[PDB]
Every structure is written in structure tokens, then in C-alpha cells.
Amino acid sequence: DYSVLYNSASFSTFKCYGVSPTKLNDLCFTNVYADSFVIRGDEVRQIAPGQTGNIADYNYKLPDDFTGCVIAWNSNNLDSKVGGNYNYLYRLFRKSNLKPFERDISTEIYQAGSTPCNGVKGFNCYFPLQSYGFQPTYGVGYQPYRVV
């Protein structure tokens, strides 16, 4: 029942694309999936069918059309740390693109220049996986948001 999960007063944002949030209560669905992940504050607007950048293109690629909802709330407590977050990582750059609905678990090295990387670094071979910055002493755009 998708009616009790809308007025529960326990979520920050609740945007639905294509399918209306008041019509999926009595609508049948074949397969229902859920991609639970935590990102930054400025990366919440990038999760939309038709955006681009360095996160929505190399990490989690979204199709052009989307017939679902985007659930995302705020924690900023029961999780996170003071003085910096050193637990989770995220890919920044990637030499190749990714098709929508695809997971990349390869710890490859981004090749910026023409020198072969993957193993040897020093110049034109940077580390793509970057660290977050979930700190409760910052503003709003620097808080962890769990996007499902």
C-alpha cells in the first residue's frame, strides 16, 4: 500500500516523475525495485530524468524518461561524523560512460592524459574515488541525504 508511505511525515522530499503520487495506490506493477544510497546535498537536484554532470553520468546514470518516484530524506544524526566523513566513497571522473541501470564495481584509475595509468600514478593518473564531507556543523548543502 503506497498510501501510508506518503503522509507518514517522515520524509524531506518526495517527487514523482511520470506516475502520479496519487494514482499508484490502486495501480498494478510487475517488478518494483529500490536503489538505496546516500549522497551530498547539492547532488540531490542532479537525480532527475534528463540531467548531466560528474555524478549522474559516471556513477548512477538515469534514463531520459522515468515513470516512478524519488524518495529522499535527511539524517545528519544516528550517522555522519564531526571533523570529516571517512567511511563512504564516490566516483568522480571516468574515462568511459555508463548505460542507464548499470552498476560499476571496478576500481579503475582515471586516465586524464595520454600516459597509461591503472597501477602507476604520479602524473595524469588521479584517484577517482573521492571522500565525502558529512559534517553537522556546516550548512544545508553539506548534509547527507539518503536517496532511495
Partner: antibody
Framework: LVNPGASLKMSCKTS????????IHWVKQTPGQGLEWIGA????????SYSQKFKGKATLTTDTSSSTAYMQLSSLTSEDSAVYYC??????????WGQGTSVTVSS | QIVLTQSPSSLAVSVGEKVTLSCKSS????????????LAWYQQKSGRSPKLLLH???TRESGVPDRFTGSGSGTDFTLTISSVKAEDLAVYYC?????????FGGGTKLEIK
């Protein structure tokens, strides 16, 4: 015209091509001598790459909004005066290696 | 910090004559993983921007005549030009592509006899 010990800033913008390159290059060539590589720049995280000969005299800054690479030269000398060429580097060359500006150093 | 040595100092070539110029690198510029030689050949006409003629020594540049052909094995790299013309005369240079720091070991003026 820069006196010895002056600071010189050179900026070049690619024409007909919009970014789409993962490296930018700086070359110093004195007349009658071959081209010498100086530094390489990266569009995202700064490459901050400098040649050992030019290390401590060259600083590399890139601004995406400006769309022009910046090179700062310090402790200029009579030997330092030369034609410096803005360049780049993608797969090979795509109208990325631009022209050069003559430098004259005198009091 | 591999310096590259290029010879000779001068090249005398007649119009429509094949010529061979060779640049030697102190260390092999072949990456072990791809087993491919790395090197760049440059043309330097007077009052002109430095221009890449051949890349990797295996691929010709776009809009470049087949007359300019380069074959390089290990440390030794060779570039061969044919049907040389007055416009073609330029300083020829070899640039290491294998590893930083980049070294320009290019160095050959082209003249017409």
C-alpha cells in the same frame, strides 16, 4: 617588456573548439633553439605539473568560466626572454597547439 | 628525465626525393602493458605554431599526406618523407610520449639542395 625579476601573465583561448581536452601545455622556445616543454594543466583537479628546469618559476591556473589557461612567470632573466606557445593535448592534436608570444626582458 | 638525442644537425633534400630522419631515445618508449611505442613527430615552419605530423609513430594525423610515414622500434625512432616540397621544409622534432616529465628530443632542420 618585463624587467629582470618582474611577474608576467600569459592567457590563450582555443578558437573554434570548446574545451573537450584533458590536458593543456606550455612550451618555451628561444630563437635558434628547439621547443622545451614547461607545464601541463588539467581541466578539473589542477594538474599543477611543472618541468624541473622551470619549477618554482612557473605557476598554472585554469578558470572554466574564463575558458583561457593562465601561466605566471617570476624571476625573469635575459636568458628567460623567449617565444612561449600555448598548447593542449587530447587524443593527438585537434587545433589545440596555439601560436606563441615573444617575450623581451630589459631594465 | 630521459633526454632524447636527434641527428643530423642539417638535412639536404632535393624536390621529389625520399629522406629518412632518425631520433634516438636513451630508454625504450614502449609501454609494457599495450606493447606500443610512444613518440610524436613535429613540423616547425618559420612563424608557425608547432604542429604534430605523426602520433604513436603508427597513426598518421588527419589531413596528412601518405608521403610522411614513420616507423619506430624500441629506442630507435625513424620518420621518412617522400616528394619533399618548399612548403614542407621545417624543423623536425621527436617528443617522448611514454612518461612524465615530457622531453622534446626533436631537432632536424630541413633544407632544399
Amino acid at each position: 617588456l618585463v624587467n629582470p625579476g618582474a611577474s608576467l601573465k600569459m592567457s590563450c583561448k582555443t578558437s573554434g573548439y570548446r574545451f573537450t581536452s584533458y590536458i593543456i601545455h606550455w612550451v618555451k622556445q628561444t630563437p635558434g633553439q628547439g621547443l622545451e616543454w614547461i607545464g601541463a594543466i588539467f581541466p578539473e583537479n589542477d594538474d599543477t605539473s611543472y618541468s624541473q628546469k622551470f619549477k618554482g618559476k612557473a605557476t598554472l591556473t585554469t578558470d572554466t568560466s574564463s575558458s583561457t589557461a593562465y601561466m605566471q612567470l617570476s624571476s625573469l632573466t635575459s636568458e628567460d626572454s623567449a617565444v612561449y606557445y600555448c598548447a593542449r593535448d587530447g587524443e593527438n592534436v585537434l587545433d589545440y597547439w596555439g601560436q606563441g608570444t615573444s617575450v623581451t626582458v630589459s631594465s | 628525465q630521459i633526454v632524447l638525442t636527434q641527428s643530423p644537425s642539417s638535412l639536404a633534400v632535393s624536390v621529389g626525393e625520399k629522406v629518412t630522419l632518425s631520433c634516438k631515445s636513451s630508454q625504450s618508449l614502449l609501454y609494457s602493458n599495450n606493447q606500443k611505442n610512444y613518440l610524436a613527430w613535429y613540423q616547425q615552419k618559420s612563424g608557425r605554431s608547432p604542429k604534430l605530423l605523426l602520433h604513436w609513430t603508427s597513426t598518421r594525423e588527419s589531413g596528412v599526406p601518405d608521403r610522411f610515414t614513420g616507423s619506430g622500434s624500441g629506442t630507435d625512432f625513424t620518420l621518412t618523407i617522400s616528394s619533399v616540397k618548399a612548403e614542407d621544409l621545417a624543423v623536425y622534432y621527436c617528443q617522448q610520449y611514454y612518461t612524465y616529465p615530457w622531453t622534446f628530443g626533436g631537432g632536424t632542420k630541413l633544407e632544399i639542395k
